[PDB]
Amino acid sequence: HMIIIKLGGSVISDYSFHRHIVEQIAEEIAQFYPDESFILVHGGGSFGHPNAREYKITEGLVGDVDRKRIGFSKTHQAMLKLNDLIIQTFLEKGLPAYSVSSSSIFLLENKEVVYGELEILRKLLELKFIPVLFGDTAIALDKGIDILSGDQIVSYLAKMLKPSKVIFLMDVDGIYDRNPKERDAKLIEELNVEEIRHLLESIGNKLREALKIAKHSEVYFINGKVKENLGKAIRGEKVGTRLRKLE
Amino acid sequence: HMIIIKLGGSVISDSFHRHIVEQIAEEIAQFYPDESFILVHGGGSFGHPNAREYKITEGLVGDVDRKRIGFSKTHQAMLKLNDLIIQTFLEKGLPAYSVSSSSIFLLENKEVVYGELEILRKLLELKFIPVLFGDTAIALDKGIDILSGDQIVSYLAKMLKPSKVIFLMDVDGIYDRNPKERDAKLIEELNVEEIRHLLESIGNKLREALKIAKHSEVYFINGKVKENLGKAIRGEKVGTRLRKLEH
Numbered sequence: 001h002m003i004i005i006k007l008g009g010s011v012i013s014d015y016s017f018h019r020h021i022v023e024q025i026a027e028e029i030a031q032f033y034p035d036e037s038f039i040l041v042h043g044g045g046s047f048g049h050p051n052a053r054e055y056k057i058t059e060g061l062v063g064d065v066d067r068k069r070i071g072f073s074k075t076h077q078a079m080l081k082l083n084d085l086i087i088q089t090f091l092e093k094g095l096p097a098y099s100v101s102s103s104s105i106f107l108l109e110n111k112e113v114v115y116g117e118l119e120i121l122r123k124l125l126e127l128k129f130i131p132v133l134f135g136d137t138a139i140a141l142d143k144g145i146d147i148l149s150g151d152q153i154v155s156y157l158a159k160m161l162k163p164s165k166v167i168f169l170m171d172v173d174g175i176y177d178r179n180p181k182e183r184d185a186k187l188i189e190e191l192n193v194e195e196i197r198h199l200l201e202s203i204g205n206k207l208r209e210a211l212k213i214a215k216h217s218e219v220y221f222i223n224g225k226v227k228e229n230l231g232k233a234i235r236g237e238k239v240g241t242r243l244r245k246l247e
Numbered sequence: 248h249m250i251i252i253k254l255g256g257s258v259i260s261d262s263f264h265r266h267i268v269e270q271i272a273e274e275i276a277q278f279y280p281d282e283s284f285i286l287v288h289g290g291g292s293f294g295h296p297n298a299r300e301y302k303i304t305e306g307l308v309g310d311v312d313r314k315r316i317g318f319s320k321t322h323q324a325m326l327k328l329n330d331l332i333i334q335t336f337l338e339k340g341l342p343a344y345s346v347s348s349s350s351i352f353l354l355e356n357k358e359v360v361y362g363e364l365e366i367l368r369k370l371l372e373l374k375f376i377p378v379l380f381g382d383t384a385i386a387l388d389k390g391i392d393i394l395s396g397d398q399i400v401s402y403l404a405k406m407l408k409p410s411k412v413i414f415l416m417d418v419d420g421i422y423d424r425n426p427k428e429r430d431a432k433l434i435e436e437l438n439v440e441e442i443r444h445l446l447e448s449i450g451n452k453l454r455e456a457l458k459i460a461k462h463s464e465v466y467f468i469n470g471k472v473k474e475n476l477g478k479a480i481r482g483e484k485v486g487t488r489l490r491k492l493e494h
């Protein structure tokens with residue numbers, strides 16, 4: 001009875017910010033809160049990618065370690081600024097969004113969460129709060145520092161909290177049989193593991209994490225810039241790309 | 248071999264005293280990275296108004312829908328002040344990293360009864376400087392509550408057992424009478440019996456200090472004079488000194 005919604009990076013922003021679509025997402029959620037429990041995870045957007053790439057966080061604690069520590073902290077602060085933008089938008093619509101710093105509760109190894117703290121998340125959901133996490137800088141056991149993607153957060157949360165469904169808000173209507181740039185690109189309504197592996201053999205992080213998530217939850221990939229898509233996915237109606245739970 | 252420094256809300260705000268934070272950072276730089284440091288700061292003029300307004304200390308009672316929104320608003324203001332302090336520390340070349348207190352702690356009777364400490368340890372190991380703040384917090388009894396900096400410091404003292412805990416205050420230390428009286432005398436060496444004498448006649452800080460002294464040496468110093476922090480870190484004579492309890 002809990003839904004995890006992953007706000008795409010290109011969805012919420014591009015240091016830009018699309019207030020209108022965040023209001024749309026909040027209004028959509030308000031039609032189901034507080035009857036359903038929601039965890040939100042928002043991407044780095046135009047706030048975290050600048051500093052992460054400028055400081056090359058994914059390289060680890062190598063070379064100029066002092067500059068990399070400073071940039072680690074600056075990138076986290078920028079992500080906190082974006083998180084505040086989103087949280088304020090959600091509060092304005094009457095929804096009690098509450099911020100949870102991903103780097104405070106997660107440890108990384110090989111881009112994957114290998115250590116987590118979920119009790120405060122559980123209690124937040126129990127008191128009918130909407131916890132809002134974000135792709136973040138994170139301490140990595142192998143390379144000191146790394147970038148924890150929102151997809152990995154969602155996969156850890158999926159395998160630990162076993163939500164009812166996981167909804168990915170993307171810039172496209174769902175998963176396509178080819179690159180949507182191409183002219184003949186067709187949208188896959190019902191996704192299966194066969195076409196997922198076929199697509200991977202030729203974004204890929206998203207398909208891999210979705211393969212893992214589908215073990216525990218039903219997955220949706222929808223276009224987050226159209227309001228009714230979120231409600232349709234929450235209500236289980238036909239919308240976007242559906243990846244049913246692997247049985 | 249690690250020192251916890253608690254920045255009182257009166258020296259960091261009451262508003263933002265950038266110069267005092269800059270002095271604290273310049274003093275800390277004399278020991279980084281040979282000494283491990285954790286920093287906790289209060290609400291000052293950021294979390295105190297919101298917490299007084301939304302009546303967070305009453306818990307989840309009355310109009311709870313407003314209480315949740317105010318809980319979140321207070322946390323966001325705390326994050327804003329935290330960012331001010333963090334950016335100040337970063338400009339001076341110290342890798343201060345923001346740890347969200349409400350993300351890793353759970354309260355009962357205003358005391359931390361649940362806590363996540365592994366990320367703090369990993370931050371200290373990788374020569375980072377964690378910076379926590381007095382915060383809003385989930386309470387197991389009243390739903391929501393205000394987690395003060397003194398309680399954070401007492402919990403971290405129990406768990407991590409720092410070499411010392413240093414309280415930065417508006418005054419030179421613990422006095423005989425109130426410092427507003429002309430004849431007040433500064434107690435340069437505090438013991439259990441002098442503490443107990445003082446309580447029977449701020450008191451929260453003294454109770455927490457009595458608890459902390461079981462694990463660590465405590466210093467009460469004036470945060471407005473730059474050199475006091477370094478005098479306390481090196482163990483020199485400064486302010487009030489509560490030695491670690493023996494038998």
Ligand SMILES: Nc1ncnc2c1ncn2[C@@H]1O[C@H](COP(=O)(O)OP(=O)(O)O)[C@@H](O)[C@H]1O
Nearest residue numbers: 008009043171174175176177178179180203206
């Ligand atoms: N078959 C496909 N179906 C859907 N999207 C695709 C496909 N092939 C390539 N893409 C592109 O990959 C992108 C995936 O975004 P992604 O990188 O997962 O977001 P984030 O940066 O938040 O992780 C989409 O914007 C889309 O343009």
Ligand SMILES: Nc1ncnc2c1ncn2[C@@H]1O[C@H](COP(=O)(O)OP(=O)(O)O)[C@@H](O)[C@H]1O
Nearest residue numbers: 255256257417418420421422424425426449452
């Ligand atoms: N016996 C005393 N010795 C020293 N200071 C005192 C005493 N009694 C009251 N005070 C004053 O009361 C004020 C309360 O400070 P407090 O708000 O507890 O610190 P913080 O800002 O860390 O919470 C202090 O600034 C201090 O000047």
Ligand SMILES: CC(C)=CCOP(=O)(O)O
Nearest residue numbers: 043044048135136149150
């Ligand atoms: C700070 C940062 C780039 C986090 C990861 O972003 P995303 O969730 O992978 O879009």
Ligand SMILES: CC(C)=CCOP(=O)(O)O
Nearest residue numbers: 289290294381382395396
């Ligand atoms: C959010 C809030 C009122 C924090 C209070 O912290 P502190 O007791 O001033 O250290």
